[PDB]
Structure 1
Amino acid sequence: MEGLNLVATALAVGLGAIGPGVGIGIIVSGAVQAIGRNPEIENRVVTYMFIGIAFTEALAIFGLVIAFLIGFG
Protein backbone atom coordinates (compact mmCIF):
# COMPACT_ATOMS: atom_id res chain seq x y z
CA MET A 1 0.00 0.00 0.00
CA GLU A 2 2.82 2.39 0.93
CA GLY A 3 6.03 0.47 0.16
CA LEU A 4 5.16 -0.15 -3.48
CA ASN A 5 7.79 2.25 -4.85
CA LEU A 6 10.59 0.31 -3.15
CA VAL A 7 9.22 -2.93 -4.63
CA ALA A 8 8.99 -1.25 -8.04
CA THR A 9 12.61 -0.08 -7.88
CA ALA A 10 13.80 -3.52 -6.76
CA LEU A 11 11.84 -5.33 -9.48
CA ALA A 12 13.06 -2.89 -12.14
CA VAL A 13 16.72 -3.35 -11.22
CA GLY A 14 16.46 -7.12 -10.79
CA LEU A 15 14.65 -7.70 -14.07
CA GLY A 16 17.00 -5.32 -15.87
CA ALA A 17 19.98 -7.27 -14.54
CA ILE A 18 18.66 -10.84 -14.96
CA GLY A 19 18.48 -10.73 -18.77
CA PRO A 20 21.47 -8.67 -19.93
CA GLY A 21 23.65 -10.73 -17.59
CA VAL A 22 22.94 -13.87 -19.61
CA GLY A 23 23.20 -11.81 -22.80
CA ILE A 24 26.70 -10.55 -22.02
CA GLY A 25 27.61 -14.03 -20.78
CA ILE A 26 26.78 -15.64 -24.11
CA ILE A 27 28.40 -12.69 -25.94
CA VAL A 28 31.66 -13.23 -24.06
CA SER A 29 31.51 -17.01 -24.52
CA GLY A 30 31.02 -16.68 -28.28
CA ALA A 31 33.69 -14.00 -28.62
CA VAL A 32 36.16 -16.09 -26.60
CA GLN A 33 35.50 -19.17 -28.74
CA ALA A 34 35.92 -17.12 -31.93
CA ILE A 35 39.16 -15.62 -30.56
CA GLY A 36 40.54 -19.06 -29.74
CA ARG A 37 39.53 -20.45 -33.12
CA ASN A 38 40.86 -17.57 -35.26
CA PRO A 39 43.17 -15.05 -33.55
CA GLU A 40 43.83 -13.35 -36.92
CA ILE A 41 40.25 -12.01 -37.08
CA GLU A 42 40.43 -10.61 -33.53
CA ASN A 43 40.21 -6.87 -34.25
CA ARG A 44 36.78 -6.76 -35.92
CA VAL A 45 35.68 -9.42 -33.42
CA VAL A 46 36.60 -7.16 -30.50
CA THR A 47 34.81 -4.17 -32.01
CA TYR A 48 31.72 -6.24 -32.75
CA MET A 49 31.67 -7.78 -29.29
CA PHE A 50 32.00 -4.34 -27.74
CA ILE A 51 29.13 -3.18 -29.94
CA GLY A 52 27.22 -6.11 -28.50
CA ILE A 53 28.19 -5.18 -24.97
CA ALA A 54 27.29 -1.62 -25.93
CA PHE A 55 23.72 -2.72 -26.64
CA THR A 56 22.65 -5.06 -23.83
CA GLU A 57 24.32 -3.10 -21.02
CA ALA A 58 22.50 0.03 -22.19
CA LEU A 59 19.20 -1.86 -21.96
CA ALA A 60 20.08 -2.84 -18.40
CA ILE A 61 21.07 0.77 -17.72
CA PHE A 62 17.70 1.80 -19.15
CA GLY A 63 16.01 -0.37 -16.54
CA LEU A 64 18.34 1.08 -13.93
CA VAL A 65 17.59 4.66 -14.94
CA ILE A 66 13.88 3.78 -14.98
CA ALA A 67 14.34 2.62 -11.40
CA PHE A 68 16.25 5.85 -10.82
CA LEU A 69 13.08 7.63 -11.94
CA ILE A 70 10.96 5.33 -9.76
CA GLY A 71 12.84 5.58 -6.47
CA PHE A 72 13.23 9.36 -6.79
CA GLY A 73 10.56 11.30 -8.67
Structure 2
Amino acid sequence: MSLGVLAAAIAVGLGALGAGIGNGLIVSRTIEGIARQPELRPVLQTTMFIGVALVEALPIIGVVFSFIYLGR
Protein backbone atom coordinates (compact mmCIF):
# COMPACT_ATOMS: atom_id res chain seq x y z
CA MET A 1 0.00 0.00 0.00
CA SER A 2 2.24 2.75 -1.32
CA LEU A 3 3.75 4.31 -4.42
CA GLY A 4 6.94 2.27 -4.37
CA VAL A 5 4.98 -0.97 -4.53
CA LEU A 6 2.97 0.56 -7.35
CA ALA A 7 6.08 1.04 -9.46
CA ALA A 8 6.87 -2.56 -8.60
CA ALA A 9 3.51 -3.56 -10.02
CA ILE A 10 4.42 -1.79 -13.23
CA ALA A 11 7.98 -3.06 -13.42
CA VAL A 12 6.39 -6.45 -12.89
CA GLY A 13 3.85 -6.18 -15.69
CA LEU A 14 6.64 -4.99 -17.95
CA GLY A 15 8.81 -7.87 -16.81
CA ALA A 16 6.14 -10.49 -17.35
CA LEU A 17 5.39 -8.73 -20.62
CA GLY A 18 8.78 -9.20 -22.24
CA ALA A 19 9.60 -12.24 -20.14
CA GLY A 20 6.21 -13.73 -20.90
CA ILE A 21 6.82 -13.60 -24.64
CA GLY A 22 10.03 -15.46 -23.88
CA ASN A 23 8.22 -18.03 -21.77
CA GLY A 24 5.79 -18.58 -24.61
CA LEU A 25 8.56 -18.69 -27.19
CA ILE A 26 10.52 -21.16 -25.10
CA VAL A 27 7.53 -23.45 -24.75
CA SER A 28 6.61 -22.89 -28.38
CA ARG A 29 10.17 -23.84 -29.26
CA THR A 30 9.85 -27.23 -27.60
CA ILE A 31 6.29 -27.59 -28.83
CA GLU A 32 7.36 -27.01 -32.42
CA GLY A 33 10.26 -29.36 -31.84
CA ILE A 34 7.90 -32.23 -31.10
CA ALA A 35 6.04 -31.37 -34.29
CA ARG A 36 9.31 -32.04 -36.08
CA GLN A 37 8.28 -35.68 -35.86
CA PRO A 38 6.38 -37.36 -38.70
CA GLU A 39 3.45 -38.47 -36.56
CA LEU A 40 3.47 -34.95 -35.16
CA ARG A 41 3.28 -33.32 -38.58
CA PRO A 42 -0.09 -31.77 -37.69
CA VAL A 43 1.38 -30.70 -34.37
CA LEU A 44 3.12 -27.97 -36.33
CA GLN A 45 -0.24 -26.28 -36.81
CA THR A 46 -0.75 -26.55 -33.07
CA THR A 47 2.66 -25.03 -32.41
CA MET A 48 1.96 -22.22 -34.85
CA PHE A 49 -1.24 -21.25 -33.06
CA ILE A 50 0.40 -21.63 -29.67
CA GLY A 51 3.08 -19.20 -30.79
CA VAL A 52 0.65 -16.51 -31.89
CA ALA A 53 -1.38 -17.01 -28.74
CA LEU A 54 1.86 -16.41 -26.87
CA VAL A 55 2.24 -13.16 -28.78
CA GLU A 56 -1.15 -12.15 -27.43
CA ALA A 57 0.57 -12.09 -24.05
CA LEU A 58 2.62 -9.09 -25.11
CA PRO A 59 -0.38 -6.77 -25.43
CA ILE A 60 -2.38 -8.64 -22.82
CA ILE A 61 0.30 -8.29 -20.17
CA GLY A 62 1.11 -4.83 -21.48
CA VAL A 63 -2.44 -3.88 -20.58
CA VAL A 64 -2.02 -5.37 -17.12
CA PHE A 65 1.02 -3.25 -16.33
CA SER A 66 -0.82 -0.17 -17.54
CA PHE A 67 -3.82 -1.15 -15.44
CA ILE A 68 -1.57 -1.36 -12.41
CA TYR A 69 -0.63 2.30 -12.65
CA LEU A 70 -4.29 3.22 -12.89
CA GLY A 71 -4.42 1.54 -9.50
CA ARG A 72 -5.56 -1.88 -10.65
Which category describes the TM-score, using the shorter chain as reference length? 0.5 to 0.7
Q: Which residues in structure 2 correspond to 1:43-62 (within 5 Å)?
A: 44-62=42-60
Q: Give the distance between the partners of 2:26 and 2:3, measured in 1 at CA.
A: 37
> Quick one: which amino acid aligns to residue 55 of structure 1?
A
Relative to its length, the structure with more helix (as a share) is: 1
Q: Which runs of 5+ in 2 are unaligned?
A: none
Runs of 4 or more, structure 1, over 6 Å off, are none
Give RMSD over aligned pairs.
Answer: 3.0
Q: Distance between the aligned counterparts of 1:30 and 1:49, measured in 2?
A: 6
Contact preservation (8 Å) 2:35, 2:44: no
Unaligned runs of 5+ in 1: none
Which amino acid letter does the alignment assign opposite residue 49 of structure 1? T
Q: TM-score, normalised by structure 1?
A: 0.57
TM-score by length of 2: 0.58
Letter matched to residue 61 of structure 2: G
CA gap of 1:26–1:2, structure 2 versus 1, over 3 A, is closer
Equivalence for 1:8: 9
Q: Does 1:26 align with 2:13?
A: no
Answer 1 or 2: higher relative contact order, Cα 8 Å, separation at least 6. 1
Percentage identity across aligned positions?
16
